[PDB]
Nucleic acid binder design. Structure first.
Lengths: 108, 177, 159, 66, 194, 74, 145
RNA sequence: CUUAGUAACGGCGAGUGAAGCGGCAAAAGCUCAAAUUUGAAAUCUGGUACCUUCGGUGCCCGAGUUGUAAUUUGGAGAGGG
RNA sequence: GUUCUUUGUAAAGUGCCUUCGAAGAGUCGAGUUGUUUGGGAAUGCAGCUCUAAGUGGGUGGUUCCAUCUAAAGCUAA
């Protein structure tokens, strides 16, 4: 019989983990820019949720390349497909807004 | 190059050419020991597509096993005990008899400096890969553990003891559900 | 009992033709590790202070030869009979007969190794040649096709 | 689902069993047993008994012809 | 009207008829616009001052340079069947068509405005003779040359890949892929037919 | 399956080359004789029993028909 | 005159309850032909061409809980789909089978398919059991005693 | 966490007991084998001599063409322009 | 931050145009004897017999359509 006594302990663990990741990845926002996706099954199709990664198509239409996308902190998925038109539009707008916000520091 | 021709030649196993090679080699391998070292892999196309480079540090042990637990894993386990410094990478079928089966298990020396260098194979040097065959982490071991993806492998995907312990032990929170 | 595609070997090239084959082939040695290294240091000493055409040599990798036959670029192909896995080279006389590239089964694998700066070679081929040895090469092609191919037309049969 | 092609199937598929003996047919057409009169269709009580009688009484039709 | 020749020396005969005839405005007709890249690139590199017209170039680049031939007196252009259609110069005497044309029916109709011969192994006017030992021995020069530059090797290749496609994409029951490929490669001079 | 598995002139060449050089397996050696004597009907029966499914045995007997016809004539 | 053959065939995926039904009925039918495996529909006619079988029973398997049995004839058989939740047999029947062509045609099939020809290959002289066929709530119920 | 004690199985009984979806925690992808470097085995081990020594370099030796390097892994990719 | 050196017709990336373009077999599968499960479409595995294909093959949905690419390997939280 397991008991989760460490609910308070592991929240403090997880928070300090994020604090270290903040200290090491200083200007960057801890997590990658994830897409916006329509959920499967009749029950949940009304819900629109955070997907895994974009696509080569959504990345190419935004105005950047796949390998470069990952270095600027955009999660890229390759097995996901662009069947829906409205989702495609929403993600492209999401990337273009993100590209206006980003400030990529020089390597010198 | 030739590996396409060999790949297709190894398909027709009971055909006249390969049938004759079997009956000669089956006699020859019985003359030698139970567990012994072959200098070169007899089916080199298969050796390659299971991760063998013909450089210093790679060893091809030939192993004999009885007929009628799995025989491929027993073959790997036998060479593991004899050649303890080596690490089992993969094994493959070469020849069989009515009484015995033969496998040409391929090994890597983690201690040899030609493997400690190059990054394509230096992963095997990591102590997490000591006796891969004794834990079923080889190709045939992972096969017998029923570890794939699908509806078929639901009760035995991420450890059959792990999913049992998860399902048959009570879980309670601080503020009870 | 041997199945006809095995023992298409052992019915090898005879004494005099094999000698004449090496009289040609020993002219076309690959430049050895020592010779190649010293040449490049000569190039380093010269070009750093103050043109050459493509040099012909024999081609000797199994993958390289199986490329060259069916490319088609090979003219003569020598094949050793003694090979540890025989199945490595059993298709090769048939490949040459199918693509119409003249081949010869030579006797001794180390005998191929001598002309090529290796221990053993299993297969050796001469893709291209210098102009002086062109007529001699084509004569040897006819010599090999008369001795090897025409005498042993029945080599595809008989166990 | 039309019955024109169904009747065309009765033309080609169906074999004449009346021309041959009951030996070759071996099929008791237990007629006048509608079985919509069976009480308790969801409890499976009279459904067991009425079918068991339908099967066993059919043997006696074939028994004389055997 | 025609000259009977085998596929080996079809190009080799043509180079003879050009060198012997170096004063007259003469036109060759070849099939592929890809191909007359090739036969133009040889002749400027085996040094005959030829001209070149094909679809793979611009319009006024094609036109203004075609304009140079029309006001000329001596030389020679190489063009396609298609790009020269509708634009015959009356100042010409030899129309040699190397290939079976695009439309074989309507081809005779475009003559009558210009002396004609063609080239065919199995396939009004008369033929000509040819003394067979007169063809230029440049095939020794060419085989070295087809191996040395890679640009000339590439353009030999496209001049071969596109030659036979057009040979298959044709009308007639006669001109359909019977011809052996050992010799059409020799018209572009290979050891092996690519 | 956009990359389904196109013909590939080389692969076709290698498969048919090995098909003759290897010879014939004992069941196939029996099978080709069974075609010439007992017909294609009984050949498909033995091939279905020997192999797994009938869908395999169709393409197998069809391959044997191609081998026999091309051997004797050409 | 009655010379027929039965051909029990199955699709990929059959065990416990359904394989109890397949194996025991294959045992109970002396003229049965037990086959390995199938995967799809047009092929089934050519399966009958092999063994000269006058009958066919095809077990199709779809949505993980259900059952879909296909009964048909060799030359030009009109098939009927089903959804159910070695002595010489005696074949009992129903009045409501003869009420419509819908149940009369399937009655004909159940006579010579699920029954027996007298000249079967594994035919035993001694009798043991009966075959109960009857309709209640638009469906059939069969038990062997 | 929930789906859920649901589907499903169990002389339907002692009872056994999931999974996809959804919310979250954490997020990272890639390497081979595959068609030739063929205008040059471009690779590595070891010994030895020095050097700025978890190593570098020269020289010698061996492995290695029965294929070690570079280039490619379907998200394609390569050849050229 | 502070410098010392950066080289070689070197190493890539991007878009367009042109020519090609190979992906794992005693394995998949098939029958059967056991083991595994609460597993109904013997699930998973092993033993034994036979053993494939390349506009292929595996898995699902009512006559097509959707979905991935096995039989090789590495990897933190």
């Amino acid at each position: 019989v397991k008991v989760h006594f460490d609910q308070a302990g592991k929240k403090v663990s997880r928070r300090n983990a994020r604090a270290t990741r903040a200290a090491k990845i200083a200007p960057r926002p801890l997590d990658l820019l994830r897409p916006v996706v329509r959920a499967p099954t009749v029950k949940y199709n009304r819900k629109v949720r955070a997907g895994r990664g974009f696509t080569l198509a959504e990345v190419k239409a935004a105005g950047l390349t796949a390998a470069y996308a990952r270095t600027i902190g955009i999660a890229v998925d390759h097995r996901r497909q662009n069947r829906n038109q409205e989702i495609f539009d929403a993600n492209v707008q999401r990337l273009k807004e993100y590209q206006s916000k980003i400030i990529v520091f020089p390597r010198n | 190059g030739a590996y396409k021709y060999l790949e297709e030649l190894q398909r027709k196993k009971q055909s006249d050419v390969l049938r004759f090679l079997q009956r000669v080699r089956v006699w020859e391998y019985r003359q030698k020991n139970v567990i012994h070292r072959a200098a070169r892999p007899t089916r080199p196309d298969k050796a390659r597509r299971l991760g063998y480079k013909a450089k210093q540090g790679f060893v091809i042990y030939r192993v004999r096993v009885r007929r009628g637990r799995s025989l491929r894993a027993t073959a790997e386990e036998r060479v593991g005990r004899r050649a303890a410094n080596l690490r089992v990478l993969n094994s493959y079928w070469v020849n069989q008899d009515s009484t015995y089966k033969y496998f040409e298990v391929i090994l890597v020396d983690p201690q040899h400096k030609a493997i400690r260098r190059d990054a394509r194979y230096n992963w095997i040097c990591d102590p997490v890969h000591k006796h891969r065959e004794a834990r079923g982490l080889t190709a045939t071991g992972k096969k017998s553990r029923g570890i794939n993806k699908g509806h078929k492998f639901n009760n035995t995907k991420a450890g059959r003891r792990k999913t049992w312990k998860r399902q048959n032990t009570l879980s309670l929170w601080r503020y009870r559900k | 009992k041997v199945p006809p595609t095995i023992a298409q070997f052992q019915y090898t090239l005879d004494r005099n033709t094999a000698a004449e084959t090496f009289k040609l082939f020993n002219k076309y040695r690959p430049e050895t590790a020592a010779e190649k290294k010293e040449r490049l240091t000569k190039e380093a000493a010269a070009v750093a202070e103050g043109a050459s055409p493509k040099p012909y040599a024999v081609k000797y990798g199994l993958n390289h030869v199986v490329a060259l036959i069916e490319n088609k670029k090979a003219k003569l192909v020598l094949i050793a009979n003694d090979v540890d896995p025989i199945e490595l080279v059993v298709f090769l006389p048939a490949l040459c007969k199918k693509m119409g590239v003249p081949y010869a089964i030579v006797k001794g694998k180390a005998r191929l190794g001598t002309l090529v700066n290796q221990k053993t070679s299993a297969v050796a081929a001469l893709t291209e040649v210098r102009a002086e040895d062109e007529a001699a090469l084509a004569k040897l092609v006819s010599t090999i096709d008369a001795n090897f191919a025409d005498k042993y037309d029945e080599v595809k049969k008989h166990w | 689902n039309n019955t024109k092609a169904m009747k065309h199937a009765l033309e080609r598929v169906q074999l004449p069993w009346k021309k041959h003996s009951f030996q070759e047919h071996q099929s008791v057409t237990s007629e006048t047993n509608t079985d919509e009169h069976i009480k308790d269709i969801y409890d499976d009580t009279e459904r067991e008994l009425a079918f068991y009688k339908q099967s066993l009484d059919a043997v006696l039709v074939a028994r004389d012809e055997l | 009207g025609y000259v009977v020749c085998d596929s080996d020396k079809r190009f080799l005969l043509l180079f003879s008829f050009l060198k012997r005839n170096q004063k007259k405005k003469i036109i060759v007709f070849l099939s592929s616009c890809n191909s007359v890249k090739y036969y133009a690139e040889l002749l400027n590199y085996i040094d005959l001052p030829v001209l070149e017209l094909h679809g793979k170039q611009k319009q006024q680049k094609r036109t203004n340079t075609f304009f140079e031939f029309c006001n000329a007196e001596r030389g020679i252009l190489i063009c396609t069947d298609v790009a020269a259609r509708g634009l015959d110069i009356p100042a010409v005497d030899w129309i040699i068509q190397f290939d079976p044309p695009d439309d074989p029916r309507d081809y005779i109709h475009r003559v009558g405005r210009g002396k004609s011969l063609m080239f065919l192994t199995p396939n009004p006017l008369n033929e000509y003779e040819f003394p067979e030992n007169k063809i230029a021995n440049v095939q020794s020069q060419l085989e070295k040359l087809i191996k040395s530059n890679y640009y000339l090797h590439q353009t030999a290749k496209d001049g071969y890949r596109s030659y036979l496609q057009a040979y298959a994409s044709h009308s007639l029951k006669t001109v359909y892929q019977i011809d052996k490929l050992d010799l059409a490669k020799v018209a572009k001079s290979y050891g092996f037919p690519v | 399956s956009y990359k389904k598995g196109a013909a590939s002139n080389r692969t076709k060449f290698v498969r048919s080359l090995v098909r003759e050089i290897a010879g014939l397996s004992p069941y196939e050696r029996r099978l080709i004789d069974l075609i010439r004597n007992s017909g294609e009907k009984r050949a498909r029966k033995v091939a279905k029993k020997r192999l797994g499914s009938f869908t395999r045995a169709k393409a197998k007997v069809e391959e044997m028909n191609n081998i026999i016809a091309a051997s004797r004539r050409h | 005159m009655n010379k027929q053959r039965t051909l029990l065939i199955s699709s990929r995926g059959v065990n416990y309850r359904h394989r109890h039904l397949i194996q025991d009925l294959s045992g109970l039918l002396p003229h049965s032909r037990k086959e390995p495996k199938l995967d799809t529909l047009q092929q089934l006619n050519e399966i009958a061409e092999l063994y000269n079988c006058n009958n066919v029973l095809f077990f199709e398997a779809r949505k993980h809980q259900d059952l879909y049995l296909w009964l048909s004839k060799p030359p030009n058989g009109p098939t009927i789909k089903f959804y159910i939740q070695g002595s010489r047999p005696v074949l009992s029947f129903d009045q409501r089978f003869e009420s419509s062509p819908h149940y009369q045609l399937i009655k004909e099939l159940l006579v010579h398919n699920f029954g027996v020809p007298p000249n079967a290959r594994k035919s035993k002289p001694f009798i043991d059991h009966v075959m109960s066929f009857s309709i209640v709530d638009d469906k059939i119920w069969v038990r062997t005693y």
